[PDB]
Design a protein around this ligand. Structure first.
Ligand SMILES: [Ca+2]
Ligand SMILES: [Ca+2]
Ligand SMILES: [Ca+2]
Ligand SMILES: [Ca+2]
Length: 292
């Protein structure tokens, strides 16, 4: 009987029996140009056929859904074996999804005698509808998205050259306070995205005796995460005119300059990585100006 073998071309990449046509993430952005080459054998020489192609979505739920269809009139060459090309044009194919080409060729004329009277009574119908044929299959590649970990910030304030610690606040002597207090902050980060830029906003808070907060200073710098998204940054608030007997604490917020997380499963990055350390009771971030 008559047979069809098929080979899909998706954005210029061909499928084969061992491997599906891979469409790069970059090429999927403007849609995918899909064509199919049909190798026919044992058709009837010089006869016309109606060739119907279908681009099927091999859905994760186990179903096949039609995405495109094209019907055209084609003619079998002398000796009944040759090749036809069917073009689906540009298709908006989904990232991470697999699609397969189905082909059906039906003769325009009756070419088969099914009752042995020499009078032809049935069309020649040949198809290739195999969801497992890798030669007919394409896969739209997924982007390599950043491995976003749970980001953390640990901080240590430095006040007039004295480090804060978890055990004790940075104690600034009265002598040291007389000419203002030089305040800087060490930010130890982990779980950020290597080589990405972040907006680091440090805010020096006055923690009053009632526990209430008041912004004394704020500085905002552009910083880049290091190797493996772990490292150290600094924020220098400069010379601060701090009040004797009062307590101050450093807050830190780091926001990725770009979207680094895909939170709606469409493969497009839509959320920034935000990491903060806003603890009014963390002694490592606290300084106290000592009384005379
Ligand atoms: Ca394309
Ligand atoms: Ca017949
Ligand atoms: Ca000082
Ligand atoms: Ca998204």
């Amino acid at each position: 009987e008559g047979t069809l073998k098929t080979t899909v071309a998706a954005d210029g990449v061909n499928g084969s029996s061992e491997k599906e046509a891979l469409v790069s993430f970059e090429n999927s952005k403007d849609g995918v140009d899909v064509k199919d080459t049909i190798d026919y054998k044992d058709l009837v020489a010089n006869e016309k056929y109606n060739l119907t192609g279908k681009l099927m979505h091999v859905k994760d739920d186990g179903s096949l859904e039609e995405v495109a269809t094209k019907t055209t009139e084609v003619t079998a060459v002398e000796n009944g074996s040759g090749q036809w090309e069917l073009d689906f044009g540009n298709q908006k194919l989904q990232v991470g999804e697999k699609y397969v080409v189905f082909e059906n060729a039906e003769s325009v004329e009756n070419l088969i005698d099914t009752d042995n009277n020499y009078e032809l009574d049935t069309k020649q119908v040949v198809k290739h509808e195999d969801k497992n044929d890798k030669a007919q299959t394409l896969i739209v590649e997924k982007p390599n998205l950043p491995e976003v970990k749970d980001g953390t910030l640990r901080t240590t304030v430095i006040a007039d050259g004295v480090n804060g610690s978890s055990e004790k606040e940075a104690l600034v002597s009265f002598e040291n306070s007389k000419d203002g207090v030089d305040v800087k902050d060490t930010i130890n980060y982990e779980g950020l995205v290597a080589n990405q830029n972040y907006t680091l906003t440090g805010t020096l808070m006055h923690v009053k005796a009632d526990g209430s907060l008041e912004e004394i200073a704020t500085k905002t710098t552009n910083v880049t995460a290091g190797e493996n998204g772990n490292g150290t940054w600094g924020l220098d608030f400069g010379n601060q005119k701090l009040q004797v007997g009062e307590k101050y604490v450093v807050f830190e917020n780091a926001e990725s300059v770009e979207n680094l997380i895909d939170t709606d499963k469409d493969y497009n990055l839509d959320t920034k990585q935000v990491v903060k350390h806003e603890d009014k009771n963390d002694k490592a971030q606290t300084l106290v100006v000592e009384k005379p």
